Structure of glutathione peroxidase:
Amino acid sequence: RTVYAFSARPLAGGEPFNLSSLRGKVLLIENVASLXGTTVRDYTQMNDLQRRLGPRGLVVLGFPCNQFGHQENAKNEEILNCLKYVRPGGGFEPNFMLFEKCEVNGEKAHPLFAFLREVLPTPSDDATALMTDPKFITWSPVCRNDVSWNFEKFLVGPDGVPVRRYSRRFLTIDIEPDIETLLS
Amino acid sequence: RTVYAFSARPLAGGEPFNLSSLRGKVLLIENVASLXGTTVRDYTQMNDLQRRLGPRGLVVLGFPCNQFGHQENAKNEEILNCLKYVRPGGGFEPNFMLFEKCEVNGEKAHPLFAFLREVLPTPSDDATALMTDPKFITWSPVCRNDVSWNFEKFLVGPDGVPVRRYSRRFLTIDIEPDIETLLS
Amino acid sequence: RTVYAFSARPLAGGEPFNLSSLRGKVLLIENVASLXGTTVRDYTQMNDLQRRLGPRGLVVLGFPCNQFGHQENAKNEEILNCLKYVRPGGGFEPNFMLFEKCEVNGEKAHPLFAFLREVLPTPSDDATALMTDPKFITWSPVCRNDVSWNFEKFLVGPDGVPVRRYSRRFLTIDIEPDIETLLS
Amino acid sequence: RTVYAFSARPLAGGEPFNLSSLRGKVLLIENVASLXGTTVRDYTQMNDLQRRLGPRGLVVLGFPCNQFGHQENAKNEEILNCLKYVRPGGGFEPNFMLFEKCEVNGEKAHPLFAFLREVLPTPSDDATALMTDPKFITWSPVCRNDVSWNFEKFLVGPDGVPVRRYSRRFLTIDIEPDIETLLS
């Protein structure tokens, strides 16, 4: 089983992009939010990765999600303006694909994220922490493989097959060595 | 007891503003958030009241709060950027005072808000509703007089004594007759 | 993995019976209720099986459960009187072990039932029906392997290992041929 | 309009009993269930009122209903068996009339109950509560005057006109002063 079964709508406006278009690419999927504490670090790093490694086969995929401290409250139409004007601000524009706002955990989760969580049930660098304060767990049902926060990272190989999952605490730029490995 | 006992720091950068300055003014106090469903409507109608009734003694005061579905996630520094370029966007600017972000409910509430809730314990148009879904109550302790949501309104007389409180659902513009009655 | 890991409290009064006592026996576990439509049929049949096949190695285990149309509403102390005086009535007494009232589905389910449902995820005779009227699904979370109603049947071999699951519609007496097979 | 327009079948075996017989009587009508938390308390205090105030013109009428957490799952034939040997048990017998099991809410409600709820639309001691958990509302349609739970009480005057309605929480014995007032 691969990611190629799935599709998502581009942020910019509907007309469903099928992940089977990206066959033979190395994918770096993140769930993103515009008003997180690691917003700037991960968006800056994802643009850097995309710019440098894109021509060698890397594609970075961003999926906005409001589940985690509601850090993506805006509408689909307002998300680019947050990024640009508020945070990271300064004229920022993602150089990579963003999709419509969807859920990653719970009964309404996007089937791409239900898959990624099934095939890679814990992050490689932090097998056990789920959430420190329960009050943030607002979706149902709650599963052992759930995404913990904004900016979890999932690395998919050139054959569609999910390779590793990194926590909210793992830096986007430190995924580079594993990416090079799949690129080679 | 009046509001003139209290002070707040302005959004832009503190130097604590005493509310005792506003003697002789009619005050319209709201707790605000940039990413709410009634953001465009309340901010528009506050701007409108401030412009039209300002010259005759109305002062509108806006207090950013992240307690209600976390609809003010940005820092004090990014808030005007939210309003101008995201929502309402289009170059929107508040024509009235905004103070730093603070809590209105629970043990760390700003003392102005602990005050207001003490002397006007339920909103004049909805005495009973507190919250439909308990998942949003994340503050402690929970008191019967607590503020339900973004954009509750408090009307204060020109002697600094709180007159009336209005719920999350009461239109800002519909308080205009009550302001008239005090303004007169 | 076997049933021997588990224990339950006897209906009659606490002092936890460990299923590892029954090692080398063939177990027929049912979830039971006293005011079901198949109450009489399954209780009569379970006593017959127990009486006839008990001396050859069969043990019938009954677990009262209120999850299904709340058909076991009484307290643990009142269950024997229902059976005896109401339904099946007539002086009826189960000849086999009953345990305290517990849940079979949802987050509070007895770990024995979470296991049985995991290792045998659908009934052998009805792979797909869960519930006809959703209004009866009152537990959370809802899982694909859930027990549908009162009187599901689980057959465990002489080595602890769960062998087959029969639906609410399968007669207790028609499990006899499979039982003989494990007994031999 | 009075109760004398209506009839019901007795628990034991129908021959429809006209309520117009009870002219000159004060009536205490309850919707009952054998397996509720207030079963022992209401049935005791109904027995008590019937015995003591019967000779002076009180008639207590009990209507079995399975609409509220299904606390009357038995058939009309087993109900007295429930009361006598399970709960309250100990040989308990109602000293007053019981009618067959019927619904009190929704499109198939008994007409006596559709009547009662029409002319006494909220319980005199709790006008607002309907149900804390919506999972228990399984009837259709749902009306503002619906009966909340097992053991609501209706007091009817000796002219067959309904006087007052009391909630699930109002003690049966505490209606004694109101019965006195009508009895006089």
